[PDB]
Design a protein around this ligand. Structure first.
Ligand SMILES: [Mg+2]
Ligand SMILES: [Mg+2]
Ligand SMILES: [Mg+2]
Ligand SMILES: [Mg+2]
Ligand SMILES: [Mg+2]
Ligand SMILES: [Mg+2]
Ligand SMILES: [Mg+2]
Ligand SMILES: [Mg+2]
Ligand SMILES: [Mg+2]
Ligand SMILES: [Mg+2]
Ligand SMILES: [Mg+2]
Ligand SMILES: [Mg+2]
Ligand SMILES: [Zn+2]
Ligand SMILES: [Zn+2]
Lengths: 136, 25, 99, 97, 212, 80, 103, 91
RNA sequence: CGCCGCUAGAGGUGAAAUUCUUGGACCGGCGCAAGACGGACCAGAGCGAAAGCAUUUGCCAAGAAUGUUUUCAUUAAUCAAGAACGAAAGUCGGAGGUUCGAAGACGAUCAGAUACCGUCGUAGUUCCGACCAUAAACGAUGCCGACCGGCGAUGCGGCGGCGUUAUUCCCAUGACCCGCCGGGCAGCUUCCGGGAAACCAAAGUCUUUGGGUUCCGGGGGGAGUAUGGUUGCAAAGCUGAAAC
């Protein structure tokens, strides 16, 4: 492939959504348009187990794969959109997203600017604890 | 047995005693 | 007045199915359609009939604005057979509910 | 007897404060009773910013922060080891160093 | 399979008056079957920030730019919105200040109706020990009038080339700071969010004149 | 020990209106000498009505919680 | 406009006790053909023939028209008698200033 | 005198038709028989004709109102909206 | 839900499984419609008789405080009967019905779970007119008054302090700064003394005992139970023993 753009040093930008649950990890390369997904590797493919699917090892193995598929298609740089399940659930990103940011920087894929788009509600409808909440 | 659930059992007993009174008046 | 000249949210009654049929939908005592979601070109109009199914009608048809008087008629328990009997005696013989 | 003069919360002139749904166990605790903190956590942990400072287009102009109103209840506070026990004169005491 | 060798690659010309008119590139199947290439081109959005489009304004205070039409590998856009980031909006929010919102539905001179918000904080005046520093809630009612005054009369009788140029140095938000010191001193006032809602006509003759 | 009969006139201005020993109030009559035509207006300082003089026929006091304030170039004293 | 209306009830408290005034429709037609009345008061639900008729006698004899912002029942309570009344006139307001303030 | 101490107007049906039915007709036999205060003729001769028609004795002006009451919760609200959608800046 | 993209898993927990998935799940994108609810600002801050109350703007009456050389001249306090307000939960009909979610069914986890945990989910939550009158309705401290230590602040008013700063600059008010006054929620310290003690500026002015006034307890159990009346559509409320 002759790819999108040649004469580099001025990077071709993409957008890396990362969706860290506490028990799954997404890395999702899009361009700036928003609709056109290049690559979607989860933590749920690279991990054969069913609880280390949120690990840094889950994330970094997801991070190698996308950066490899992005080294083929000729795009160079990636902005970073970042989140967790922010409806009524927790708002910290999990222990994987803070590690996939490391491994994207290692295997190619130079970095744009990073933003924290976790959708913060205003109304906050009822969260699933009950009255007395979670027990043990 | 809590005084909470002690009140509930005195209630549950009294309601059957009530429906026994109103049965054979 | 036509539905293309009222703003959306207008609670109307006796509006028309297709224009020039002189009043068909939402005529009974205490019913109302409410014009929502105009289409500027392709002159059409979504309306919530008194069921809840949004029909889209042609927007040259006219609707007398407001609810039909007699709203909340059925709130009286008829409560005796004769008053059940006289209601349907003026209408038609549809009364014999023999199971 | 009274373990505290506050009786835990800080409703003093009022009669009713809205509950804030907790984060961990999601038990609704009124906010003047709840354990309350605010963390300016950096978006990348500082060992890995040096990766990202050297792999960026800009001259380390990109430095963003992650603000969380992080909101605990008093059952899951000590259960997560924030709000250590103190002593009978040490309950009187105020803001940490 | 590689459908990413089937996909053609447009690049997006930005509008005028920022500093630069190139943003990036996109992906689209050029054509096939019933489909037209420009099917998807008309609605793809972009949320790209400043400090590459301005020669160094504030690096936050993004914009929402949607791709408008098709023109020979240079698909082209138009203004759709201004946003900010969640960090900087949650930055500068201390527990002992007070946050005063103002938002107004307002028509531009031509057919575009925009809703733009506003956010201000009260300022801790220098030489201060009394740490509360709030507003009496009547001057909050007065200063919502202050912003909903100016954001009408610096938007209502103006065009987009007037008002999008008012967004870039925040010429409105600086002026609200200067006018309203006699009520209470304020602290880092921004527009926060602007949202489009009515777009009556396509007008590509207005679109190209917006570029050259 | 402490004094009641002979306190200091520093102390008793500071104390509240009806909390001292003689309880005489804290308002005064002020001699608004407007340049209108001729008239010297005696007017209560802690006023409540718009004190409109009869010659010049404009405003001389603002109704304000506490005490009135004067409008433009009005001079005054106390009558004692 | 609440400081306007509450004044008018205090205004109708004045003429009710000191000034001279007439109560009803026929009596306010006799007083308006004499040129005698000063200010006519119109209640809000009077029939539109009667309303614009009293206007037409006003524009002849050049007598001030006021539309009371209220139903005829509480016009009767404003004029301080338990029956209801549509049309009043104020035929000699002695100490009053109704015919002073808005006109 | 307080003759019937609970039922009021539904002392005419008497022994029968069930308790919670007569409770639920009492509220609405009162409403259709009262002499409502007319907004036009000033008097209280608002008397209903047949269902959905209301009628005042003096000035003889006939108004379609509610089916049992004079107004409806719908009636005030739609009058609230229809002026509000009228003064919405030319229609 | 309707479409554009991408693709094998996706929620789920200490683990897993039920549940959703090449018929396209999740994840990105543009919109659209519905209902609950107003996040962060949010405090040992405010107002409310109590339960209580948080987006802006209008509208309607109401109120404490403050300033008062205004006013009637004791019109006062606390209250057997009697009356109105009274969270959530329920009961009755009316509108719709997002999320949470009693019962209900399921998967685990245990010897057992009908339990915590997980998934689906009624009644309920929500709005409209009626009901019911209970709570840890807690300051677990009746209300009015008089007095007896301090300081540090603060919230709302009022006065003063020719030190700044915003309109344009006298001219007013803003914004802080150092005050003094009043009443307010709270705090710190103290051997005023009180307290069985914890502790308390009121739980002090008490054997050196008498300010005025209302409600009440009298060893634990049986028990607010039986039975009466009384109210409530009902669920239940108020009043209330005795044997032993
Ligand atoms: Mg049948
Ligand atoms: Mg049958
Ligand atoms: Mg003890
Ligand atoms: Mg409480
Ligand atoms: Mg299936
Ligand atoms: Mg008494
Ligand atoms: Mg309730
Ligand atoms: Mg029922
Ligand atoms: Mg029914
Ligand atoms: Mg569910
Ligand atoms: Mg002050
Ligand atoms: Mg008492
Ligand atoms: Zn918790
Ligand atoms: Zn009539």
């Amino acid at each position: 492939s002759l790819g999108p753009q040649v004469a580099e040093g001025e990077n071709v930008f993409g957008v890396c959504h990362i969706f860290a649950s506490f028990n799954d990890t997404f890395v999702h390369v899009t361009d700036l348009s928003g609709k056109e997904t290049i690559c979607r590797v989860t933590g749920g493919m690279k991990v054969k187990a069913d609880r280390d699917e949120s690990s840094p090892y889950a994330a970094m193995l997801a991070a190698q794969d996308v950066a490899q598929r992005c080294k083929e298609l000729g795009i160079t740089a990636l902005h970073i959109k970042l989140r967790a399940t922010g409806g009524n659930r927790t708002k910290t990103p999990g222990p994987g997203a803070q590690s996939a940011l490391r491994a994207l920087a290692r295997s190619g894929m130079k970095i744009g600017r990073i933003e924290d788009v976790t959708p913060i509600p205003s109304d906050s409808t009822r969260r699933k604890g009950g009255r007395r909440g979670r027990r043990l | 047995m809590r005084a909470k659930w002690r009140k509930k059992r005195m209630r549950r007993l009294k309601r059957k005693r009530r429906k026994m009174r109103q049965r054979s008046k | 007045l036509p539905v293309g000249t009222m703003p959306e949210g207008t609670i109307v009654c006796c509006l028309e199915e297709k224009p020039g049929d002189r009043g068909k939908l939402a005529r009974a005592s205490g019913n109302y359609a409410t014009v929502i979601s105009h289409n500027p070109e392709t002159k059409k109009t979504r309306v919530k009939l008194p069921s809840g199914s949004k029909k889209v009608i042609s927007s040259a048809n006219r609707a007398v604005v407001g609810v039909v008087a007699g709203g909340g008629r059925i709130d009286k328990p008829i409560l005796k057979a004769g008053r059940a009997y006289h209601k349907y005696k003026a209408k038609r013989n549809c009364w014999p509910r023999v199971r | 007897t009274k373990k505290r003069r506050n009786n835990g919360r800080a409703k003093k002139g009022r009669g009713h404060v809205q509950p804030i749904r907790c984060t961990n166990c999601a038990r609704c605790v009124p906010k003047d009773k709840a354990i309350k903190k605010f963390v300016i956590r950096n978006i990348v942990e500082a060992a890995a910013v040096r990766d990202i400072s050297e792999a960026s287009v800009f001259d380390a102009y990109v430095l963003p922060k992650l603000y969380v109103k992080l909101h605990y209840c008093v059952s899951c506070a000590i259960h997560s080891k924030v709000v250590r026990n103190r002593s009978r004169e040490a309950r009187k005491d105020r803001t940490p160093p | 399979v590689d459908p990413f060798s089937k996909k053609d690659w447009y690049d997006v010309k930005a509008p005028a008056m920022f500093n630069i008119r190139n943003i990036g590139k996109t992906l689209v199947t050029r054509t096939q079957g019933t489909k037209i290439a420009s099917d998807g081109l008309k609605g793809r959005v972009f949320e790209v920030s400043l400090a590459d489009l301005q020669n160094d304004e504030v690096a936050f205070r993004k914009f929402k730019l949607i791709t408008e039409d098709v023109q020979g590998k240079n698909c082209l856009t138009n203004f759709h919105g201004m946003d900010l980031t969640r960090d900087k909006m949650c930055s500068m929010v201390k527990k002992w200040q007070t946050m005063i919102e103002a938002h107004v539905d307002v028509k531009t001179t031509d057919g575009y109706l925009l809703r733009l918000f506003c956010v201000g904080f009260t300022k801790k005046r220098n030489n201060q020990i009394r740490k509360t520093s709030y507003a009496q809630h009547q001057q909050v009612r007065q200063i919502r009038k202050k912003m909903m005054e100016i954001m009408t009369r610096e938007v209502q009788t103006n065009d987009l080339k007037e008002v999008v140029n008012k967004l870039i140095p925040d010429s409105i938000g600086k002026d609200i700071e200067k006018a309203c010191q006699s009520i209470y001193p304020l602290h880092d006032v921004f527009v926060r969010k602007v949202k489009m809602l009515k777009k009556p006509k396509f007008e590509l003759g207005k679109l190209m004149e917006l570029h050259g | 020990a402490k004094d009641l009969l002979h306190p200091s006139p520093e102390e008793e201005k500071r104390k509240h209106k009806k909390k001292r020993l003689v309880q005489s109030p804290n308002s005064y009559f002020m001699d608004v000498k407007c340049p209108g035509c001729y008239k010297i207006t005696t007017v209560f300082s802690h006023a409540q009505t718009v004190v409109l003089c009869v010659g010049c026929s404009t405003v001389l006091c603002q109704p304000t919680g506490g005490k009135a304030r004067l409008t433009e170039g009005c001079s005054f004293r106390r009558k004692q | 406009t609440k400081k306007s209306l509450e004044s008018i009830n205090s205004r109708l408290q004045l003429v009710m006790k000191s000034g001279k005034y007439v109560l009803g429709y026929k009596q306010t037609l006799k007083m308006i053909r004499q040129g005698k009345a000063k200010l006519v008061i119109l209640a809000n639900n009077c029939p539109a023939l009667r309303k614009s008729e009293i206007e037409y006698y006003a524009m002849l004899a050049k007598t001030g028209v006021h539309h009371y912002s209220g139903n005829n029942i509480e016009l009767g309570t404003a004029c301080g008698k338990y029956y209801r009344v549509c049309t009043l006139a104020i035929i000699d307001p002695g100490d009053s200033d109704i015919i002073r303030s808005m006109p | 005198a307080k003759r019937t101490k609970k039922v009021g107007i539904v002392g005419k049906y008497g022994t029968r038709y069930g308790a919670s039915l007569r409770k639920m007709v009492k509220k609405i036999e009162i409403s259709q028989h009262a002499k409502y205060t007319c907004s036009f003729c000033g008097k209280t001769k608002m008397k209903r004709r047949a269902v959905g028609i209301w009628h005042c004795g003096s000035c003889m002006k006939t108004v379609a109102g509610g089916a049992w009451t004079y107004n409806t919760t719908s009636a005030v609200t739609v009058k609230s909206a229809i002026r509000r959608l009228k003064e919405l800046k030319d229609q």
